[PDB]
Amino acid sequence: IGDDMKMTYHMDGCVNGHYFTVKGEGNGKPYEGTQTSTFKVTMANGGPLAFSFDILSTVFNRCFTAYPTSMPDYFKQAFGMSYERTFTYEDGGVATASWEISLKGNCFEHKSTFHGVNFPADGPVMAKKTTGWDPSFQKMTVCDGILKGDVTAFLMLQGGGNYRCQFHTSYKTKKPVTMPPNHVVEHRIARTDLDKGGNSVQLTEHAVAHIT
Amino acid sequence: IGDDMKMTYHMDGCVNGHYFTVKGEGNGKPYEGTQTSTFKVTMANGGPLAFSFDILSTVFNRCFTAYPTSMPDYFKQAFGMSYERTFTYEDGGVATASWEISLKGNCFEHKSTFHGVNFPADGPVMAKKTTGWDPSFQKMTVCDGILKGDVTAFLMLQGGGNYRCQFHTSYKTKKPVTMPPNHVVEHRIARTDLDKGGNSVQLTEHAVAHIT
Amino acid sequence: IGDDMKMTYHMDGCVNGHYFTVKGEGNGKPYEGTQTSTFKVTMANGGPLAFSFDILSTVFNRCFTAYPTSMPDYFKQAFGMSYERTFTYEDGGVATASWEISLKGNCFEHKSTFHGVNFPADGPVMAKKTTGWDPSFQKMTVCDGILKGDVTAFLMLQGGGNYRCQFHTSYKTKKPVTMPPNHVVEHRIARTDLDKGGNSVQLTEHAVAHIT
Amino acid sequence: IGDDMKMTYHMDGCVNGHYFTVKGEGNGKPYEGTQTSTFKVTMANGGPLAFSFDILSTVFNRCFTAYPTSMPDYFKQAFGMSYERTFTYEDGGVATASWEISLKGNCFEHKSTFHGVNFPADGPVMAKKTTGWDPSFQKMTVCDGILKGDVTAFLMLQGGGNYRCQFHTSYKTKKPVTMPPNHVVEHRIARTDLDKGGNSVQLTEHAVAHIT
Fold this sequence. Notes:
4 copies of one chain form a homotetramer. Chain A has 2 helices and 12 strands; from the N terminus they run βββααβββββββββ. Chain A is mainly β. The first copy, chain A, has a single domain, classed as Green Fluorescent Protein (Beta Barrel). The first copy, chain A, has an 11-stranded mixed barrel with strand order 1-2-3-12-11-8-9-10-4-5-6. The PDB classes it as luminescent protein.
């Protein structure tokens, strides 16, 4: 893992029956726990993003996490890895997502699949009324050989309110690595739309692990 | 809708990171609420079915339901239709699925996408320890113009026990139809493996609507 | 168990911080699966019922169930019994309840405790906007020696809509009885307010078990 | 609020049908976010604690939280307050709890009610196989005038594993106070049994609020 890394993404998604794909590129600093990427969403039925990109943001790599130089870094040791995330929204919307991260040189290849259903036709997701995720604290624990991550996330809404989403993630390594103690990952994710429709968008994440 | 109908199916799925596809054909009696179909699962990485087919069975059409000749048949009136189902398993496994049913002559075309994550590596699903679904009672209610279906299903296990799964489904019609009163759909689904691996399998469903 | 039985009830409850008690009397026909009772709610802080009585109705006896004269009647064989119910409302309200039923002659003594929290100050419960429960189908299954009951219930609302509540119940017998096959209990519960405030209210239930 | 405060507690509880009460006393430093208390559990049916005290620990006051001298302290401003907590355990156990905190001089009076059901007869709770809560990060957000707290907590188990519990709390002030920004409360709770049965036990909590 180098001080500076490159990224590439490809996503195959479906939300409320809407087929779509995503392409992206970015640059990040694994040791600093920072990264920035630019994405382009392509609706199968050519058109503007049909839902809040925020449902996708967290899917688009724990290698980009600042870990104390003592604590086992489950991610760094892996370098690939498989990710599986369950998103349970407070209004009945549910999304499942799984992805794989591979490394070629200084390039991280991220390939994912996303599938969301039961999102209210008029909720924050479908109506694109979200602004981004509130800073969160992801609790990392070990469960039967695999690293689990849990977080009661909050999607901020245009207007001021928030929309609750419970995240449950399984982090799987292709091979055995030294397991970490239970810990927490502090995150900051920011979304910046590059176009009105939100088809072109930029994402930045800042993450730091804390010994608890 | 004829007394006798033909069916064809195509599924694009992913479970715990495993890509797969499904093809099937069947015949059914819409008015009688009966149907029988034969499927063939093809694991992307050529091989035996990697998980319990029972997670897929309910995905593979409410037109095959016996409704009293008085009660509005939300399904029959539609004839296409979009389906969205959330499967929440008691052991953390979660699957989302969405499909579309179209009608050509006496042929029902069923195209679906399935995505499951967080299934315990050693649970009933991954270990293929299920036998089939226990007869259920699906509560149908109207919610903001759409027909909803809810059921606390039970997957029977080899050995005797059961594995709980809450089903939440949205039934959407391409156009407006006369809404039903809240009601219940009584179901019986039976799975019959045609080969050891369970790649080739047969399914039969019997469904009857009840005025409550 | 006689063809005609008498009932008496006493409840100690708390909802959103509101202490209250309940007293009731009724008569029922165990073999017919019918029963009618009259209750009187007393708010600790003297006053009108502070929330929908419907949250309490299902707490106020499976002995009042019509079972086929062949099928093991887990309830009848018991005659006492302990009940434990978890109520998970769709709007975040949660209620836990446990009760005991004892039998003296032709009199059923029902003693219960109810505790509800997180009900939206302005939801259907607190605002008393419910009308009653929609007819339901309670799925009965055996789980580790005890009879479990699950139901995705629907509280009907003034105006027309419905409010979802998942019921999860454990039925415990003081001693060993012949276990039933998984089955379903069809219910009809009706509430009739005897006074404006709803402090005095009448309840009637009709239940029939079905071999599935 | 003084630099040093005194506490007294009284709890009325029920778990899996077991009636019990609790009495306690402690001393704490509100500004430092520290506190220590000693409790004595009395089982209605005289005997050793029938379940893990850890289910009760978090019930036994956000005034004991270190807040930056700039950030609105929703708790301190209140000084009484009402608390409502929903505990959803991963194995089906559910507990609801509500309490009130009043202040007399340098004495905090804490009166609570606890009610738990559906805990597996042989799970970590009933079998008293827990050691304590893993350090957590409670996300505090505002929801319709009230402060909400959410946390995906982890009860550590004898042996090494953990048992998951989602905490959902409503914090209500008797009167209007300046609302905080969404934030996080970092906690450390430690339990020390003073007797074999765990009837006599000591608790210590350390809490610090973080501007996010």
